Design an enzyme around this catalytic site. Structure first.
Site, short mmCIF file in Angstrom:
data_model
loop_
_atom_site.label_atom_id
_atom_site.label_comp_id
_atom_site.label_asym_id
_atom_site.label_seq_id
_atom_site.Cartn_x
_atom_site.Cartn_y
_atom_site.Cartn_z
N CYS A 1 0.82 -1.21 0.00
CA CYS A 1 0.00 0.00 0.00
C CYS A 1 0.85 1.26 0.00
O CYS A 1 0.97 1.93 -1.02
CB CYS A 1 -0.93 0.01 1.21
SG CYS A 1 -1.83 1.55 1.43
N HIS B 1 -4.47 -4.19 0.16
CA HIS B 1 -3.78 -5.18 0.99
C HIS B 1 -4.10 -6.58 0.49
O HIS B 1 -4.95 -7.26 1.07
CB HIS B 1 -4.18 -5.01 2.45
CG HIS B 1 -3.47 -3.90 3.14
ND1 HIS B 1 -2.19 -4.01 3.63
CD2 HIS B 1 -3.86 -2.63 3.42
CE1 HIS B 1 -1.82 -2.87 4.18
NE2 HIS B 1 -2.81 -2.02 4.07
N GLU C 1 -2.62 -9.30 0.81
CA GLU C 1 -2.33 -10.36 1.77
C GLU C 1 -3.54 -10.79 2.58
O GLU C 1 -3.53 -11.89 3.14
CB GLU C 1 -1.20 -9.92 2.71
CG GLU C 1 -1.55 -8.85 3.73
CD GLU C 1 -1.39 -7.45 3.19
OE1 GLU C 1 -1.64 -7.25 1.98
OE2 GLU C 1 -0.98 -6.56 3.96
#
Ligand code: CTP
Ligand code: CTP
Ligand code: CTP
Ligand code: CTP
Ligand code: CTP
Ligand code: CTP
Lengths: 535, 535, 535
Positions: A389, A507, A509
């Protein structure tokens, strides 16, 4: 046909740091593998209303749900082990309860009754619990709700939650409520024996508040002898099927095998009278193969701001390793401290040893020039880069400075910059799931194999839409945007400028699961393996 | 067909003096009326091995079983309410347990193992409990064993018994073990409301040792409002069928109606799954009529040695009143202190107001001349007399002194008497049930309507067999003996010498039951009523 | 001048096997070094009246006082660390209390009062405690009594002792009573941190019975961080001087240094206001030198009957090592199982590797022919031998069989032997301290440097006084006897028959202290070192 939604509380005794979270997650995994629609919930004891105030470098990352609710990082383990999205309701805290009841008090919605702790607070908690039995957006109702009670039994920190659990056990009845319990079994070195007495004193403290544990999970560094399991079943009045050995496993992904080898889940299914069906390991044996039989080791540097506590990056590291497992590669993480990388000589000294570099997020940190230096080095050296980010914002600042916009900055870090390539749109703080569109046959489009994606966001600054054409003079394609084109979502260098240098504002992940890795981390590890093969 | 013998523990909280004994007795009465073969047991906490050492003028009488076991007077209420004989096993104490285990230790029967408190003591207690499920001398096995745990929950005085109860609850399982619980509900005068908080703190203390109460009996001076019963069911997790109001009843014989009007016993039968059958009151409505509708009042003096504690004579007083109920007469007892009656002027001042005088036993007292003076007065005045045990020895001394054997005595009270009309046979201490034979068509034979009787004994001195012919010069017939004639069992004056003056060595009050009064007390009250009618 | 005798209770929490015994012993050592007359007491929880019934192969040796009282082996550590003889009063048990009170009950010495647990039992315990403040046979009164309360706080096994401690704390007052407390601090391997929560729950349980701990001893595998000591002082309300780190020491003799380096004893002396005086280490630095700087290693075989639990020989092994320290030699013990030594080939295979062999006692064992075979081997091989008690009886049987008395035996092991060289005098069971006389200028007289000795005994069989002249045909001198010559006390072979082969009936290991080793074990290690030097 579906009976009532069962509840399965879990509470810790003797000590914290015993693994209630991963244990409950593994139990959810096993029940999922049987085919039950499990869902999960955490009841944090602390009074923070949401964790966005908390310092992640001491308390770990902040997870973000589909509906943009900030929650404790513990919710991530439940998402990963279930492979299911969870609502923001999955994390109750004492702060939400007390501030809700005091708000309804000031608004006068209790008709001037005195606001006791009992019943008003514990009814509100019971309501927040029973809400998990409500049908989802598809109208399906979960079979089991697993509810990790935070703190330790006997903490003043948890008494209202345990009184609420007692009341739920009264209203639903023991056919439909089960209590697990987790307790320490210390090993004493001078005598060389396991001692059960702390577990007896724990179950005594638990009974003193009117909860009866149906099974014990014993946390120990070695398999508990049957001669102590029988003594515990005697002194705790726990059915001897339900005293379960649980050694310290080699890794978190092995714990489902531990729980299944002691046959905990068969006893849970028999005790709750859930629809019994056989466990299928086919989804998880292949994971355990990939975890235990790496063909090769590949090193990724992760350029964290502060790295003495790695828990601040938990889901990033787990998403990397889940990507590694897709190529049967042991991803090993070189924890690189960004403040060592602000000079190109220090950057070379740190980063030259690895096969890829990753730029994680850093909401709320100050001073990013180390990350920009690390990216400028990685570009010159040819190291693959991914920016999560703040990673994209450092990549964009680096790109702009490479085309001579020397004083370019983010308005977050220099509000007085003459070239705010990243600027406030405090503007709209974007949270949660938003659609995005990909340039067809872009490198990201080649990775995702589709034009339509969605991602979870937590940022308020955006690429300045006036600079896109100027920044594109670097060759940096703005290969994804909002569907109206108004907002920047992805950037990449072309395949012949660099092998793989991508950023996002997302994000990614948070959409990781070990049975379903995120496409970008798979592609990034593919590029890092190709760099290893070429070098 | 008979299932396993159920167990039904009863334990007190908040305070002693709440009536666990009479409550458990009334529950036994109701289950008996349904037709279940109930039996009962008391677990005293004190370390006296048997009560024969205890001072009865502070701790009440000593009861004596058929097999001659001395037990706490509490066993008398169980016998009376069941109308069943109980073994000496019906009264365990901590003294019997600890002295048993230490005896087996010194005899080396534990193979040199270390004698812990757990498990050795609590297994011995569990064995003493489970022995009550063994078939009787007829081979019948009781359906229910009710076991009053002594002391209060949370006393160090009782912890081993409650650990034994916990173990029994583990081994038999909740299908077959039930816990009643008895707790105080104080009334506060300044605020005028009942407070449940002491009962909550009690059930919390009980749960802290791993026992779960299935019903609460609330002891209160007024009917518990339904608004507090619901709060107790909430805060104790007691099923709301099982919160039972129990006011202070008018008399002990009314308590079965109290328990049935709150329908406790139906819940017990449903919870234990005993063979359900209707209650028949026909045996007890007639008792309650006789108790509440006396046709006349008749006064009996009881010449006790010390009378400031009436509990020292409990079973005597209850046998008198059970006799009264047979004639529908309210027997009222004039408690006369024997030491006021040693002079004939004091005897006249005390005894002249009554319609009969009774000479109770007095094992272990010293100085009896007051009783002899009282009997000599009663004979001259014509008052009916009954002498229980020491009563017969005072009657016999009085008779001998009336025929000029002026220094006659018992060898117990003057070992140097020249005329031991009562002498040691310490000789054989007779205990328990022995046969006796009656002179056919004697006054006692007219009362018992048979020649064959049996009685319970507790004495070591006997009528001197050499003096029988001499004493009979008084007209005193030795109207009953041992079957061999060797021992004296009864004495009487002839019907035309006095209307009714009888003695025995027995304790006939121990065979009292209100549905089955002892024949001698019926005849004695008949004579006292005839004296009232004639005077 | 002497103030009142202070009391210093010690109680364990969380777990047993934490070293309350050695900790309290080391505290006694430090207070002794200041010059206070300390004495000590153990309050065992088990109901064995004396340990002579206990199987030592599972519960360790039985210690024997000067007055011949059998006590727990724990008393040995107190004797060794104080270097003071202790009375048989030094070991109370629950068995002595309960059997005393029930005996006084049956003898009727409570005047017929009901024998409750409180106050009668706890007053008896308080009396058994306060007896230690009575002046000794010289009329000296101890300054401090240290009283290790057995079991764990919260055991039903210990509640009466802790109620007695509470009462003592009431009657003497906090100026004169101190509580130490010992509690576990577990290390958790996955998180790598010490957890204080079990110690908080312990001190909470201790306070729940009305005892306030004045200091905590924390038992841990590493030095407790100051950051946890401050948290414990906060959450336990223990003065922060009095939270003491105590790692697992290298050896038991190092623990006084551990306690002094945390300055526990200065706080104890300041808190009790004892007469403050400086510690002198001069007596113990030389011990720690000898313990840590061995010039040579010498191996002694110890021919135990069963050797899988070494605690059965604790004081024997400690007396050997105390002898070693006198020659600056590391005595290492080859634990040889006697049943391997019954054949001379097995004896040679086991014993040939060592520089000496020791025959320990074995009261209550069966079958000794292994020890006789081992001695016959050791004699032929020339290995130095010492026989403790049964050791002398095996030496004597071996000697008699060497002169052809082939069927010779002890009457203990063959009651039908035609040659009872050891026979019952069950005869008089000798217990405790008895005088003995030595042959002047005997080898034993050369060791003790005196003709007059005393020893502690625990045997009922003796050398047959009719056989002395016959056995002396072996050359075996009966070099010591009772002062009347009636009883055999020592045997030896002459210096030119063997270098050192001695036996006794005594247990000389009980007079061991590390600052004052027993003369025979010093001489025996001298002979074993001389054998090492010669071989
Ligand atoms: N069956 C288990 C239980 C715990 N752990 C280890 O225990 C650690 C604790 O992780 P976590 O579950 O998240 O608990 P904590 O965060 O440390 O503290 P808490 O109990 O409050 O959750 C993990 O690193 C994990 O490796 C484990 O390996 N196997
Ligand atoms: N609820 C209990 C539990 C134990 N004890 C007593 O505690 C002693 C045993 O001590 P300890 O070894 O420390 O406890 P264990 O039951 O044996 O378990 P562990 O090995 O872990 O110590 C025994 O006398 C036992 O009777 C007791 O009185 N009440
Ligand atoms: N439902 C009840 C319970 C108790 N009582 C009264 O409570 C008194 C107590 O008698 P008892 O049962 O024998 O108890 P105590 O001897 O006084 O003491 P404990 O509880 O140990 O038995 C009795 O006089 C009885 O009148 C009553 O009238 N109705
Ligand atoms: N297990 C409990 C029981 C009660 N309370 C609190 O205690 C207060 C009520 O005080 P009190 O009147 O004395 O207790 P009651 O429940 O109302 O019962 P009682 O009338 O006998 O007093 C309430 O704030 C209630 O929440 C509590 O925190 N936890
Ligand atoms: N400060 C300490 C405390 C304990 N120990 C070790 O703990 C063991 C326990 O010995 P002991 O004092 O006799 O206790 P236990 O017999 O095992 O059990 P208990 O607590 O009842 O005395 C010893 O071997 C000793 O080495 C130690 O090395 N240092
Ligand atoms: N008497 C206490 C002690 C602790 N807590 C709460 O327990 C939590 C801390 O959990 P934990 O780490 O397990 O206990 P610690 O005090 O921190 O000690 P330790 O490290 O050993 O765990 C805190 O919210 C604290 O407020 C509490 O409510 N009441």
């Amino acid at each position: 046909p579906q009976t009532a939604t069962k509840h399965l509380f879990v509470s810790g005794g003797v000590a914290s740091s015993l693994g209630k979270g991963l244990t409950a997650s593994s139990l959810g995994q096993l029940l999922t593998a049987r085919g039950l629609h499990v869902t999960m919930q955490k009841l944090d004891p602390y009074l923070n209303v949401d964790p966005g105030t908390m310092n992640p470098f001491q308390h770990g990352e902040v997870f973000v749900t589909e509906d943009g609710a900030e929650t404790d990082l513990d919710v991530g383990h439940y998402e990963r082990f279930l492979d299911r999205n969870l609502p923001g309701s999955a994390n109750v805290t004492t702060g939400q309860v007390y501030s809700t009841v005091i708000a309804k008090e000031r608004r006068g919605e209790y008709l001037g009754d005195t606001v006791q702790v009992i019943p008003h607070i514990t009814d509100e908690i019971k309501r927040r619990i029973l809400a998990m039995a409500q049908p989802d957006a598809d109208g399906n109702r979960p079979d089991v709700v697993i509810t990790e009670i935070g703190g330790t039994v006997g903490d003043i920190e948890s008494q209202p939650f345990l009184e609420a659990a007692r009341q739920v056990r009264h209203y639903l009845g023991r056919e439909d409520v089960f209590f697990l319990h987790v307790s320490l079994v210390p090993y004493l070195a001078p005598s060389g024996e396991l001692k059960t007495k702390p577990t007896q004193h724990s179950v005594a403290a638990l009974r003193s508040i009117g909860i009866t544990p149906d099974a014990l999970i014993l946390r120990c560094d070695r398999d508990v002898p049957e001669a102590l399991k029988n003594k515990i079943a005697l002194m705790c009045d726990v059915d001897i099927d339900g005293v379960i050995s649980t050694p310290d496993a080699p890794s978190i992904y092995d714990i489902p095998k531990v729980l299944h080898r002691e046959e905990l889940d068969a006893f849970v299914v028999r005790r709750l009278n859930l629809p019994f069906r056989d466990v299928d390991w086919t989804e998880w044996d292949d994971l355990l193969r990939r975890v235990h039989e790496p063909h090769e080791t590949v090193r990724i540097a992760l350029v964290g701001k502060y790295v003495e506590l790695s828990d601040a990056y938990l889901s990033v590291a787990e998403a990397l390793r889940a990507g590694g497992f897709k190529h049967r590669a042991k991803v090993e993480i070189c924890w690189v401290a960004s403040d060592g990388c602000e000079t190109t000589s220090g950057a070379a000294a740190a980063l030259g040893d690895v096969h890829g570099v990753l730029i994680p997020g850093g909401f709320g940190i100050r001073g990013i020039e180390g990350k920009i230096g690390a990216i400028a080095y990685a570009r010159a050296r040819g190291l693959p880069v991914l920016g999560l980010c703040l990673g994209l914002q450092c990549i964009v600042i680096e790109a702009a400075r490479s085309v001579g916009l020397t004083n370019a900055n983010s308005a977050e870090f220099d509000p007085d910059t003459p070239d705010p390539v990243i600027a406030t749109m405090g503007g709209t703080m974007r949270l949660g799931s938003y659609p995005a569109v990909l340039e067809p046959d872009s490198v990201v489009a080649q990775a995702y194999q589709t034009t339509q994606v969605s991602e979870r966001h937590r940022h308020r600054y955006e690429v300045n839409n006036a600079y896109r054409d100027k920044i594109a003079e670097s060759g940096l394609r703005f290969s994804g945007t909002s569907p109206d084109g108004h907002l920047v979502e992805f950037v990449e260098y072309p395949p012949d400028r660099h092998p793989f240098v991508v950023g996002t504002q997302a994000h990614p992940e948070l959409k990781s699961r070990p049975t379903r890795p995120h496409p970008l981390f798979v592609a990034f590890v593919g590029a890092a393996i190709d760099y290893k093969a070429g070098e």
